[PDB]
Design a binder for this molecule. Structure first.
Ligand SMILES: Nc1nc2c(ncn2[C@@H]2O[C@H](COP(=O)(O)OP(=O)(O)O)[C@@H](O)[C@H]2O)c(=O)[nH]1
Ligand SMILES: Nc1nc2c(ncn2[C@@H]2O[C@H](COP(=O)(O)OP(=O)(O)O)[C@@H](O)[C@H]2O)c(=O)[nH]1
Lengths: 179, 403, 403, 179
């Protein structure tokens, strides 16, 4: 038997760190030393209990100017990664308002996960201060657990591309849910 | 005896490796022990080879510059079984060839049956995994330690680390934190996430620094021709490579340079240890256009290999093709043509050629995909097909030719 | 080219042998063809061996004193499969060893898998048949033709004939009648049923005479030590033997002599033909007591081998033992003792010793059998036990010692 | 599996050629060149459709002085060879009177064959003349077929040790019947 190829699709607001985590995990690089690429999308082989899987990572533009074309890549998806920044409250809001609704439509039974990003920013003075000045705290794990089950995600996971904590787990669970 | 000491050392190193699950390093220990016994027995006129029939299995044998036939025989069977467990099937015959004539002379047909059973299975596994890609021989990393205060004699030293299966950068990183935080206290260990040659001339002498860079096996054109299989490119490897973005860090295409660093370890992998000091290193810088050219080349070959296949992968084909013509997030291969292929350097005979081969590739890609879509896409293939043609015009436009 | 002619000849000889079902002779044809191609290719620097790596498979190769690697490879696989069909498993590795390095260089793992599958099976068969005795490699016969009138150039000529499986004297005899009666008319063919060196000085010049004598492979003490297995005693055999009764034909023990004739063929079996001219012969006469001694020896070893066994055969043990102590029809081992061990020649230190070993054998035989009888015999074992003891007294009596 | 060992027992009048055929077949010799042996009984390997069998041939004394001990070797028999000379009319008579009765008793279900010997003597003037002078002809095949089925032998076979015609067949059928 030849290796199985799990189509995974990443969706979430622009600037939540979508492309950053994809490139980071798949090139085995820290953000700071990406050799820039003109091409989109990413392929990575992951080891899930004995077996090698080739994970196909489809990167989507999160802006409205692309609302119409984005879903063209939604047919065939085996699992969805819905991203939001744990330090961008609007990010979180789009999850419930725009994102999981957008996908649940086309791929009704397709499983998705709740991915929260940039969690290393939780320990950042500048960012924290920015939040306070609008009367806000970064999304916390548990609150994100809630959203998850409510909206019926397989589960919720979080990571930092920058410190690469949680990074492996994210794409693991991604493969588990797609299976 | 020193051969007896060396043996003792290798045999315990082996039980440790076995415990840790580092089977190839255990196997190498068996081979080194076996090569030692063989060399000695060869000098005594009991065996006919020694060290050098083992040099094919590993060049590191050169480092080994009571015992009798029966011991040798038992060690050889040990190496064979070692190599089976390491999944280095291709290498088992090198060992058994040494013991076959002994079994024949002893008329040990049961043993011969067994060994040839193993070789049959081994060569059977080989075609399997050459096709199923399920043999995962390891990932490699440049690791460097900084901080006389906590590392001492280890300060400044760079190693290649060989890690299990598909060990990600993210995973070995952590593991070295948890390791050196549990040894030098939590808040005392810092990680350098930058691949540049670092000077201690700006490190806080208070902390232990660890730098971890992913690297891959490197080969020149002659080596790529001697090593035709993936296995040959994963065995007896001494040189590793990584590429680093720089500007004269990461900029726009017009200015994007790349540094390719080749690291040479003092011994090859696999070895009796899973980390090996770097012996030597050097680098090669690439211009933004060289970069472009190189980047473009890798994509067309990427597509061709996908197209020209029997076990065609629809998902992995769309992924590569969509990210080729239906580019949403990043710049787009056109950025190379706009910034480089307008109206310099006559080596552009390369940059153009590749763009000629590029369109031909997406076309064949579209073509192939045309025949895979379960209709539910179909429209999706049209936009792609539409984008292909669209950009095809753009390139033709700037290059003043067809597409 | 002569190599091309020789080839042609060997390849058709092979199809004939295959048709006749004489597989080992077909195999030898493949080997001779293969050795020819190898020798030639070795001279051209394309192959590294030639003739002499095949000398181990057959000494007859020495007789061979368009073509390319790929042909050689196909012939080698042909020899291997030839030898499998001849059931000469032990020999297959000698061929494959020649093609293994070629497959390795070509990275042909599928081929390597197959060849090692064959070797595993082969060595598996070997232990089987070494135990089950179901490999039947052939029976051998001295055949001689007399009668210039019908045989011509064949008159006087002696061959060793190699016949399938367990071909009995009775069967090859007939077959040569039906063969030479259908060629020289029925009433014109006569069969000489006597093993003595015959002089035409008393043959009816009117008839064609055929003399057929059963013979078995012969080896001296050095050869019996180089050839430990039955297979080694059935492969590359050049000397054959038969024994003939004579008197100074068949008489009483006091006068019974024996002539042992050793025949040497011009080539060894197996060969590219199933009959081979006798090159040379000689003989050795034995006295009646030497005869006795020799006959006695064969029986005790016969019994011991039966006794000292795991897969003990009750029927074949009684048969040999009953015919040892409960002798009804023939004379009885006592006839040797009465005619030879009374009160000559001091070599009797042999004749007695054997009689000492003889009683010890029947005893152990009784002993063993005591533990096999399903009671329905029991009485039968008693008479035997009774006869053993009875005669035991007789021998003790005449030899003036215990038993 | 190790080779199977068929115990076969030979019975019939003295002087019918019992020992002669046994030694002849098993040593692959013509009668005239037997190296005489002091030992009884014979072992021979025979090829019966692919398989090698080790045939165990038990030779019996045919005289009355041995009536009492002869049957000691009858336990375990897998098949019986009842011999008579096709040129000895008394031989034939004992078959029905003494022989097949003697055996049928101890080994009631054990199969036996009717073996007729010395058939080359049928073409002998001396022997033929001897028969005529008592008003006799050699037993013919068919007449021996009759006896066979009547007495319920598996079948009847005949051979000459001297010309070895029929010799192979005899021990073949012997193995077939024992099976
Ligand atoms: N500190 C920090 N910054 C991040 C992380 N992930 C992404 N970023 C930054 O977020 C910015 C936008 O991220 P991007 O890759 O474009 O995400 P996208 O717009 O959703 O595709 C970039 O400047 C990144 O460097 C993270 O884990 N930590
Ligand atoms: N012409 C001829 N004589 C035979 C044949 N078989 C046996 N004889 C002779 O018959 C005589 C007695 O035979 P023997 O072996 O003692 O048979 P047994 O007494 O039944 O054991 C011997 O002289 C043999 O040579 C045969 O097939 N043809």
């Amino acid at each position: 038997s030849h290796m199985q190829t799990i189509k995974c699709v990443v969706v979430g607001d622009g600037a939540v760190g979508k492309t950053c985590l994809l490139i980071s995990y798949t090139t085995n690089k820290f953000p700071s030393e990406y050799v820039p690429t003109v091409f989109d999308n990413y392929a990575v082989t992951v080891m899930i209990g004995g077996e090698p899987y080739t994970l196909g990572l489809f990167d989507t533009a999160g802006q409205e100017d692309y609302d119409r074309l984005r879903p063209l890549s939604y047919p065939q998806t085996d699992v969805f990664l819905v991203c939001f920044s744990v330090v961008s409250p609007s990010s979180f809001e789009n999850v419930k308002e725009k994102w999981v609704p957008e996908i649940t439509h086309h791929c009704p039974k397709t499983p998705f996960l709740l991915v929260g990003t940039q969690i290393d920013l939780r320990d950042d003075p500048s960012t924290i201060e920015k939040l306070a000045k609008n009367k806000q705290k970064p999304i916390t794990p548990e609150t994100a657990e809630k959203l998850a089950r409510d909206l019926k995600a397989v589960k919720y996971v979080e990571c930092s591309a920058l410190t690469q904590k949680g990074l492996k787990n994210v794409f693991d669970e991604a493969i588990l849910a797609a299976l | 005896s020193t051969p007896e000491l060396r043996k003792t050392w290798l045999d315990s190193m082996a039980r440790i490796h076995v415990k840790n699950g580092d089977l190839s390093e255990a196997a190498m220990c068996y081979v080194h022990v076996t090569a030692l016994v063989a060399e000695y027995l060869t000098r005594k006129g009991v065996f006919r080879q020694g060290c050098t029939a083992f040099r094919v299995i590993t060049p590191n044998i050169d480092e080994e510059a009571h015992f009798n036939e029966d011991v040798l025989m038992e060690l050889l069977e040990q190496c064979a079984d070692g190599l089976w467990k390491a999944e280095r099937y291709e290498l088992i015959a090198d060992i058994y060839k040494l013991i076959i004539p002994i079994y024949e002379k002893r008329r040990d047909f049961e043993r011969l049956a067994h060994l040839y059973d193993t070789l049959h299975r081994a060569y059977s596994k080989v075609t399997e995994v050459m096709h199923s890609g399920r043999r995962l021989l390891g990932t490699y990393f440049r690791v460097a330690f900084f901080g006389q205060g906590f590392f001492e004699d280890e300060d400044g030293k760079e190693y290649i680390y060989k890690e299990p299966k598909l060990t990600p950068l993210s995973e070995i990183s952590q593991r070295l934190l948890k390791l050196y935080s549990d040894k030098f206290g939590s808040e005392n260990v810092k990680m350098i996430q930058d691949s540049g040659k670092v000077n201690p001339k700006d490190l806080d002498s208070k902390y232990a620094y660890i730098q971890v860079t992913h690297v891959i096996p490197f080969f020149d054109e002659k080596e790529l021709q001697e090593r035709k299989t993936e296995f040959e490119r994963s065995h007896n490897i001494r040189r590793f490579m990584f590429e680093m973005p720089f500007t004269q860090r990461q900029g726009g295409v017009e200015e994007q340079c790349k540094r390719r660093t080749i690291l040479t370890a003092i011994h090859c992998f696999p070895y009796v240890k899973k980390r090996i000091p770097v012996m030597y290193q050097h680098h090669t810088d690439l211009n933004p256009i060289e970069v472009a050219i190189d980047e473009m080349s890798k994509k067309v070959a990427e597509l061709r290999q996908l197209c020209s296949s029997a076990e065609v992968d629809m998902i992995k084909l769309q992924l590569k093709l969509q990210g080729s013509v239906s580019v949403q997030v990043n710049a787009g291969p056109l950025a190379y043509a706009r910034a480089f292929l307008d109206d310099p350097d006559n080596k552009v005979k390369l940059l153009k050629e590749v763009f000629r081969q590029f369109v031909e590739a997406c076309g064949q890609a579209l073509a192939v995909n045309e025949r895979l879509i379960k209709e539910d896409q179909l429209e999706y293939q049209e936009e792609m097909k539409a984008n292909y043609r669209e950009m095809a015009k753009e390139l033709s436009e700037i290059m003043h030719e067809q597409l």
